[PDB]
Structures are given as C-alpha cells and as structure tokens.
Amino acid sequence: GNDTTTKPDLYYLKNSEAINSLALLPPPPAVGSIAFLNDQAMYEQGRLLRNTERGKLAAEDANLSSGGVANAFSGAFGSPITEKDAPALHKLLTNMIEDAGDLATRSAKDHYMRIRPFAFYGVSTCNTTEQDKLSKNGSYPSGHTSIGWATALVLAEINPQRQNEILKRGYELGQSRVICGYHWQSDVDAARVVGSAVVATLHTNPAFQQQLQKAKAEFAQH
Amino acid sequence: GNDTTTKPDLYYLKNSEAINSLALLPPPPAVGSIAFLNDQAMYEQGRLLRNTERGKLAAEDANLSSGGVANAFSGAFGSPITEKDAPALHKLLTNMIEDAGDLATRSAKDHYMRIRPFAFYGVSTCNTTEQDKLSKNGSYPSGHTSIGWATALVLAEINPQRQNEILKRGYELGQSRVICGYHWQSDVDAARVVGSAVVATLHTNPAFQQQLQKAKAEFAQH
Amino acid sequence: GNDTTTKPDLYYLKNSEAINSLALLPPPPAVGSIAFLNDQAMYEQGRLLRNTERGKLAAEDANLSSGGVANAFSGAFGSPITEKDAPALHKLLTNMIEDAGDLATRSAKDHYMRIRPFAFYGVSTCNTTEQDKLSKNGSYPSGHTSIGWATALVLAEINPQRQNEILKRGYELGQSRVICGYHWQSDVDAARVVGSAVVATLHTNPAFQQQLQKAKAEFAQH
Amino acid sequence: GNDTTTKPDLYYLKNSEAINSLALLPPPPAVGSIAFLNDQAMYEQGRLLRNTERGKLAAEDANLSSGGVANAFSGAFGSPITEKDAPALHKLLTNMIEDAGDLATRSAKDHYMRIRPFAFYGVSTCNTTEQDKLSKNGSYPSGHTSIGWATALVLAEINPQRQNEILKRGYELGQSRVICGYHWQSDVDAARVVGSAVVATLHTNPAFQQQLQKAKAEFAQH
Amino acid sequence: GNDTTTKPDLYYLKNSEAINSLALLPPPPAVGSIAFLNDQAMYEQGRLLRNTERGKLAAEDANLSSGGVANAFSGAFGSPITEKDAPALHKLLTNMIEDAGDLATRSAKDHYMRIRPFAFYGVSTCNTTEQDKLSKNGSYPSGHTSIGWATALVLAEINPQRQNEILKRGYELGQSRVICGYHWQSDVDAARVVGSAVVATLHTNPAFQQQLQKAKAEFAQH
Amino acid sequence: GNDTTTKPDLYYLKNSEAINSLALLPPPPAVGSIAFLNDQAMYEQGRLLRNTERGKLAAEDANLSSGGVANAFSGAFGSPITEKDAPALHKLLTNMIEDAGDLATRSAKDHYMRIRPFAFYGVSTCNTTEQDKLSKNGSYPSGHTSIGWATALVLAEINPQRQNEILKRGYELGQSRVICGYHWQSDVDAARVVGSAVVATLHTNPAFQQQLQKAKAEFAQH
Numbered sequence A, B, C, D, E, F: 001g002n003d004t005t006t007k008p009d010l011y012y013l014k015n016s017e018a019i020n021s022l023a024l025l026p027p028p029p030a031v032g033s034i035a036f037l038n039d040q041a042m043y044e045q046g047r048l049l050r051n052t053e054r055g056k057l058a059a060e061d062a063n064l065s066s067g068g069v070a071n072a073f074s075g076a077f078g079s080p081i082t083e084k085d086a087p088a089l090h091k092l093l094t095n096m097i098e099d100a101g102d103l104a105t106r107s108a109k110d111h112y113m114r115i116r117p118f119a120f121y122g123v124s125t126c127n128t129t130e131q132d133k134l135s136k137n138g139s140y141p142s143g144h145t146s147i148g149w150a151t152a153l154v155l156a157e158i159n160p161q162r163q164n165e166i167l168k169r170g171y172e173l174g175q176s177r178v179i180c181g182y183h184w185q186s187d188v189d190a191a192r193v194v195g196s197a198v199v200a201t202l203h204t205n206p207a208f209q210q211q212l213q214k215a216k217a218e219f220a221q222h
C-alpha cells in the first residue's frame, strides 16, 4: 500500500516504519462471543442516537479525508486550524493522516476483514459518502478512530493547556463511528491502541519532528 | 495527592498538568450490562491461565514501582535498561512512573472506586503482595496498565527498530493485571487511553524533554 | 396535560393528586444491559405469538379508550359491563381510564420517552390503529397496562368471588401490548406498579367513592 | 395454612378468600434463561450494596414480622405508627400482614419452591434472623415485598398527601430483599402484583373496612 | 404417517418401528434462553459464510432428496456412488433416506413445530428449492442432518479406511443446514442423536441387512 | 495409547482403528462465548438436582467402569444383564467400554485438555470416586456419555421392542455427568457423536460381530 514514498503529503512514514497492528492487536470479537453481543448492543444504542445532535455531529464526523480532520478539531483546539489561519499546524495534521488511518491499521484490517454493522445488518451508515468505498474495507481496527486519537494526541502537545478538550474530541471522534454505523465498538477501541503507537514512530521521524517544531512555534505567536 | 512538587523523583507533571481521566473516559461497565458479563468471562479466562507460563509472567508483571517497569522492558528493548547500563534511560523511565500511574488515573479511580475482581470474588490475586495496598484503590482504570503503555510509547520512540516488541510487552504488562485477578478487562483497556494521553503531556515537559534527549544520546551507546 | 379539571369524564384526580411515576419507578432497562436483552427475546416471543389465538386476543386488547376496557372484562366479570346493563359499573370504569392511563404514567413516560419496539425494529404492531398516535409517546411505562390492572383491582373488590379471573384478564390486557409489539416487557411490568398505586389514590376520591358505591349497590342486581 | 380463623390477629381473610398466585403469576425465570442471568446480575449488584447505608437499611428491613412493618413505614408516613401513638392504624397494619405475606403468596411459593440466592450461592443473607426458617420457603414470590407493597398501598389511602414517599418505602422495602440475599429480583417483582391484589380483597372484607375506617379517622385528628 | 408400506423405495422401517424422537429428545431451546441466543449467533455466523466456498457447498448440500445424498458422499467415500458404479451402495443410501429423515424426526418435529430461522428472520434460505415445502415443517430436529449422520455411519461401516472422512462429511452435511438457514444449530445437534439411533433400528431390518451386505461386497471389486 | 493389543477385555478396536475425535469434532466452547455461558447455566441446573431422585441416579451412573454399564442398562433393557443371566450380552458390553470411552475421545480430549466443571468451580463432584483420576483428564468430550450412547445403540440393535427405553437411558446416562459435575453440557453433546461413530467401526470388527450375534441369540431364550 501507499506510504510516504508515494503520497508524501498524506504520510511521513514508509511501510517499513509501520506498526504491525496484526501482531499487536488481539483478534476481534467473534460471532457467538459475549463481546460481539456487546458490539451489537453498542450499535443499536448508537443507531438510536443518530437522530440526535450527537448524531448529526457523527455524520459530519465521517469527513476527515482531507483537511477535514483539522476541521473536526477546530473548536476543541481553541484557535481555528485552517490552511489560511494556521497552515504549519494544518499541514502537520494533513500530512500525518494516512500514517494514522492506513499504516497503523493495515495489517489487522486486511488480515481479519471483519465485516461492518451497516453491512452486517444491511442498513446504511449515517453518512454514506465513503460507505461503498469502505464497504470493502476491513472493519477492524477503525481508521478514523486511529486518526482522531493520533491527531488529538498530537494536538495535545501543541496546546497542552487545552488537552482535555482536545483529547475528548479525539475520543469523541472515534465514537461517532459507532453512532454512524461504520464500525463496531471493538473497532473503535482497538484503533486507539494503534493510533497512539504511530504518534510514537512519528516522534522519531525527522520530517515530523520539524513540522511539529514549525507548528509549535507558529502557534506560539498566534 | 502527590505530584512532581512533593515527590519529583516519580513525577514530572504537577496535579495541574494532569489529564482529566474522569472526564475523558467513559463510565466503567455496570453490574447487569453485557459489558460486565464480558469482564467476568475474561476474569475466568485469566484465572485458568494463572498456572501457565503466561500466569508465570503475569505473576512478575506486578512489581514495578521500584522501577521494575524498566526491567520489565529490558528484554524487549534488546538492551538492558538498568541504573548501571542505561543511566539516562533508567532515570527517565522512573521519574515518570507516577505521571502515568497516578495522575493519569487518579481522577476517575477515586470517582468510581470500582471494585477489583479479587475482591468482587473473594479469591485472592496471582500476586498477593500489593493486593492489600490496592484493595482500597479504585480498579478503573488500571495504573500498572497505564504505565506499561506509557513507558512503551516512550521506549518505542527511543528504539523504533524494536517498537513492535516494546509496544507488545507494554500491552502485555497490562493484560497480566487481568490474568492476576487485579483488574477487570475494562480497566486495562480504558487504561491505555490515559496511558497514551499522558505521554502527550510529558513531551511538553522540559524535565521530560531533557532526559528523553539524554536517553536518546546515551542510547546510541549501550 | 389534562386531568379531572379539563376532562372530568375520564379523570377523577387532578394533576395535583397524581403519582410520581418518574420518582417511584426505577429507570427502564438500558440498551446494553442483560435486562434489555430480555426485553428483546420477549418481543421475539410475543411476535411469533401474534398469529395465534393469543395474538388474536392481543389484537383486540388494544382498543380501550372508548371504554373498551369495560368490555374487555365483561367476559371475566361473569356479567356484562355495559352502558345499558351496568350503568353505575360502566361509568365508574370509564371516568378513571385516564387517572390510571395518563396521570399514573405521564411523569416517567415523558421523562424517558423510551422507544417502543415497533419503532425500535421498524416492524409495525399487531394493531396499527393507535400505532401512530403512540409512536410519539414514551413506551415506559405502559398505559393500557396500567389500566388493565387498575380496572381489575376495582372490579375484583366489586366482584371478589371472581377476582382471580378479573385479575388474570387485567394481567393479560397488559401482556397483549407485549405481544402486539406495542410495549417492551419491562414497560408492562413497571406499569402494574403505578397501575396499583393509582387505585389507592382513587379510593381517597369522593367522586370515585360515590360511583364505586353505586357500582356495588347496582351490582347486587345484574 | 393459617388464616383469619386461626390467627385472626395476623389475617383478615380466610384461605378461601385468598388470591391464587399460582394461577395469576407467570412461572419464575428458569436457570438457563436470560431473565435468571439478570436475577444473578441483580444479586451481585445487591450484594455489593450491602456494606453501604442502603445496605444497613436493607438488613434492618428484613424485620416486619410483628409491628416492625409499621416501624419501617414510620418516616415515610410522617407521623409515627406505634401501638401507643396510633394503635388503630398500628392494628390495621399488624392484622393485614399475613394476608399479604402468606395468603397472597402461598400457591406459587409452594408450587415452585424456587431456591434462594443465599442458598444458591451458599453465602449468608445480610440479616440471618429468619434465614434458616425461610431457607425452606419457596423463594417466589416474596412475602416482605407483598407486605411492603400492600401496606404502602394501604397507607397511601390514609395519608394520600404523602403517598409518593409512602409508596417509595413500600417499593424500597421489596428491594431491600434483593440487596440482602433472600430473594432474586424476579421474586420481588412478582410479589407486587399479588400484594396489590390482596389490598383489593381486603377492601371487601368488613373487618378491614372497619379498621380502615378507625385508622382513617384516628389519624384525621392526629 | 408415511413409510415402507406406502413408499418402500425410501423407507426400510415401518412407522411401528419409527423411533420416538419426541421422547428421546429434549425440547428445543426457547426464545428467552441463553442457548437460543447462541442459536441466533450461529445463524448470523452461518449467514456470513453463505457466499464462500462453504456456502456453495451448503447450498448444494440442500439437495439430498434423490441421490443427492449419494452424490454428497462420493468425494468422501473415496469412489463414486452412482446407480451405475456403486449400484448396491447407491441403492441402500437411496431407500433409507426417509427412515433417517422422516421416521426419525416426525414426533419431535410435529409436536414442537419449531420456527425455522429463515421464517424467523424473514430471510430467504441459501437454496430456496425446498424453502416453501419446509416453511411449515417443524424445525426441531433437522431431517437433513439426520440423513447426513445416519448415512455417514452406515458408509463408515462399509469403507472403514476413511471413516474420519466419510464421517466428517456427514457431520458437515448437517452444518450446511445452519449456514443455509433452514435449521438452528440446535436442531442440527439434536438431529444427530435420532440420526445415529435409526442406524440401530436399521441393523435390525433384514432388508437393510441384505442390501448393506451386498453394498459391502460390491465395495470389494470397485 | 491403550487398546486391545494391551487390554483386550475392554477393547475390540486397536488404536490404528480409533476414530479421530479431534478432527471430526468442533472445539469446545470457550470462556467468552455465549455457549459456555449456557454450559455454566446447565452446570448450575445440574447442581440443583444433585439431591433428588435424579441426582442419586446420576451419582450411580458415575459407575460404569466395570459392569456398572451393564447394570446401568438392565432396567431399560427389560431383563437383567449379568455375567450369569445375559452372559453373552454382559460380555459384549464389557469389552467395548474402552473403545467408546477411551479410543473414541482420546484425540479431542488430549489435545484440548478442557477444564472440568468441578475443577473449574472448585466444588467436589457428586460421586468423588473418580474425581481425582479424572481431575486431570481432558473434559471435552465425555467418555462416560460415549459409552452410554455407544452401548445404548448396540443394545437397541438387540432388543428393539424397547429401543426408546434402552435409548432414553443411554441418553440420560450421559446427562448424569452434567448433574454430577464431571463434564459440561457441551462435552456431553459432543461425546454422543464420537459415541455413535464407534458403533460403526465396531460393526466392522469380526469379534464384535461374533459376540453381538451371540448376545442377540441368547436374547432369544432369556
């Protein structure tokens, strides 16, 4: 799959620096397990939440694909994160996205091919934009959750004084996937183990440690 | 409670610079939910494991406070983290035991004072040593857990070529609690969240920065 | 809402003299608890029953408002409660439909606005007639239920030699909701509590006293 | 079993006026049913509550056997209910006790012989006074719950202006049995159907309708 | 009932020699039990495999009716069972089918009249050929699983060089009904008991005796 | 392994002809599944009957080892199976025991090495005679249930006037292990598959052939 060598504006890492989720993450809950039963319970809870504000916020949370992530984190961060208002931070996030959404979650996703609620129950997610595209994507672990958690983790280092609010968005971001219908609760949960793992590799990657430096200081006068 | 102001040999952060564990994390599984039911079967599973190698390891992953966490990883770091071999590493790892163990959890540990399983069942742990001091300590979320992960995201940014073994052991240091009857599965899972959120905060700390730096320089050596 | 002041043809009590359904009753089973899981298997069970005699009866136990509750019992009262045969009985039974149906439940119905099952599942009821008017009405606790029981404790103190049949039918008038997909088992159970608590209050009401008296005198007749 | 003809100071009814619980109540949850699983869940929840105030109040709630019931309801009722302060009410309650605790619950109790938690798990209730005596008593339905509910129902007619507080004690009384270890939650729940049923028969029994009259007026000047 | 006195080419035993499945077998799980909760989970896991190599096999396994059974064992038997290759054989398998499928399931089936998963969920089976005919034929126990097992045991007593094989197929041959959705895992497990039982009553019939020998013989030079 | 080449009076088949249970059988439920949750519920229901007519029978059923099996079928067979009444018979039953009990369970057993309920809960069985010996003998599948079934099928092919009977006993003969607490319901259900399978491999052995005839013969005048 891609990596920095082919999509250097969505990754800071090579497939070789990737975290092996397959080896690090426990198998997903099986069907006929009590844990799955809870996944199913979490979906229904989630699904009934959909026609609530938390629901609307869940649909408009499936969108992070491009710059959207820095959009989802605007309020929590405090200052707005736009290409125009904070492009150093805005690039930092935009660049690390697929490292979080694809590298960190690839081995397991692909190895297990867990199915997805919407496909399991045969009912549409709350935001069908990427549905048909993800419909063939391993459900476990979740990409957005990994992204949400890693970004938030990264943002918490820039604006520590606002980490609780940030971190919560990060977390809340993963949960929106449960409400929406794209991931079972276990997908969302495992995603955070991996998503915290990449932010570690990223702290060793020079390209990241420099954009982080530019994002830090760029906000430190803004 | 304490922090870097009262015992700066185990904290970097101040009660002020800590994560709102209670605000970030969801509430533990309640008795009577499919969730707890799973926590239970988990405990059973861990129990039957106690008398096998894993149980053996589970036995040992209980001692850390002294900086045994450092020695828990020495094996998967490919180099031994000790006070005589990796002074900068070893110190770094110990000055933050409590930033990750107490500050990262304390807020929600106290607010839920959830029942540990050795106490919920009467049966004792796989390691009774701290069983006492802990019986009157909230179960949610796990502190050993949030220290195995925290101390892993840090040893993995210091030794990326071996991040998968590091990260795995840190994940395992947390499973042990579950096999030792010390924590419910849910306490361990929820602990990796705060565990990962503290490192973000740590990276914003001069004292941690410094030593993390020295740790890296010195690493080129041992 | 209404009461004996706005529509005294269906109430005896005033919003003031009503039970705190919301304060007396525990919270409904939440999605994700073994409790709801049972509510579910119950619904399934009721569903498969719909196409049998019980289902047949379940079908009919849905119409009451007009005073069909009176006619629901006529069979188990051994005498027919009608407007032409037991005027005092029939009136008594109807002037309190709403003391038991609305006032007895309203408080917690609104506060939980719990999801009925035809709506939780998409599938429609065994009797679609009131399915509309009710879809936007809290499910917890059941009002038909709290009227089948209330109207039974009253017909059983009026005809004690037949109290077991009376009480059984009133219990059945409530099970029907469960078989009709109108209410969850838990809505029905919790409804017998408020259903029974209203009669206590009714016995303290002059208007109810009077008619209850006339009902008894007249009973010696038909 | 006894009745008014042999224990006229604990019953107002004859075995012939008794409500047939066996016929009116649904079978109790079986072992291997989801409902039982919830009973078990409710016990553990209950048991962990025992070393709480609600717990202490649960132990000192197992005592209603003689005049105790009117004691349990003192606060909720407002005025004290003692042989010396309100002996007309105090007799009314003392006399109707076994009608509620034994008649209403006899056919089912004896027919099913459901076992009890304390005996099921082999651990002692919170108040072992009647343990060995009840240890051989059908667990389903519960006597105290029937008593608690019926008294409270009856008390609510004397002091309507305080029914919510009364009724709650009534309800809370049944629940204390779950916390204590004598009854499964299903026992406590079914008990209230029957307990509301007897208060109906009692409203047809002359001896009751006169003591009620004396209790009403005796409080209506007190 | 039907049998050899009315359909001698699919039957060997008469009704007088049918085995009482109703009696020898426990009742099927019930909506409400924990085992029906697992009947459902296995229905779900079955669904997920309908479109895989296994689901195709399942679909084909739905066809035993006429020689389908022989042709379902050929791969496992080691050679081909055809009316013109293993004639003696093919003949045997052909006339016992109904013994194992009808006779050895009628009582349980007819009495219980259990809902099939497909009718339960309202979801076409995986090989609708029979779905209608069987849509109103009791689910508990599975007649296809019986044949599968019955015949697998008789063939094992013929070609013992590969019993593991001939047996493993017979086993799976019943599982297919769970994947196809015609039966619940429980009707399948049950079906094997009556399935093995009839092979006993069959060793009791002279005709079966005759044939089977013949078949065993022919296996010599073949 | 042991067999007829080392213990010819309890064996008929050699190891080379043992049936592969490991292979022909699904794995035993696992702590975490819904079916092990039901394995437990059946363990609990088993316990409750230990002190009843059935529990005594269960206790006695734990003794087949030597002629216990013959003496466990005598009531159902219709006559007495004694070394001096139904000698030919008694002999057969006596030397197949190990085929059905050891040979037809070794692989599954040895491989899986499943925890017995008694060891699981730490609660003496209902007939501790064997408990020690078996305390470290894999639980999945049940060897006593195999014998029970195996032998019940061979006897049915002898005294077909009462197969329902001879069979119902064999069935129960395996259930006893669940009430006694030596096996989980699941090891019992599994055990019957390998139990019926061996009776096939047995009809393949000339010796079994010889004996069984003899036994069938003797049943003529007896």
Ligand code: MOO
Binding pocket: A134, A137, A138, A139, A141, A142, A143, A144, A145, A177, A182, A183
């Ligand atoms: O992208 Mo997920 O893997 O649908 O969050």
Ligand code: MOO
Binding pocket: B134, B138, B139, B141, B142, B143, B144, B145, B177, B182, B183
């Ligand atoms: O220290 Mo825990 O909180 O026993 O892992």
Ligand code: MOO
Binding pocket: C134, C138, C139, C141, C142, C143, C144, C145, C177, C182, C183
């Ligand atoms: O009226 Mo309900 O509240 O549909 O029984």
Ligand code: MOO
Binding pocket: D134, D137, D138, D139, D141, D142, D143, D144, D145, D177, D182, D183
């Ligand atoms: O008296 Mo119960 O039947 O222990 O409440």
Ligand code: MOO
Binding pocket: E134, E139, E141, E142, E143, E144, E145, E177, E182, E183
């Ligand atoms: O024939 Mo079944 O009864 O659909 O296996």
Ligand code: MOO
Binding pocket: F134, F139, F141, F142, F143, F144, F145, F177, F182, F183
């Ligand atoms: O012999 Mo078992 O393996 O205890 O039935």
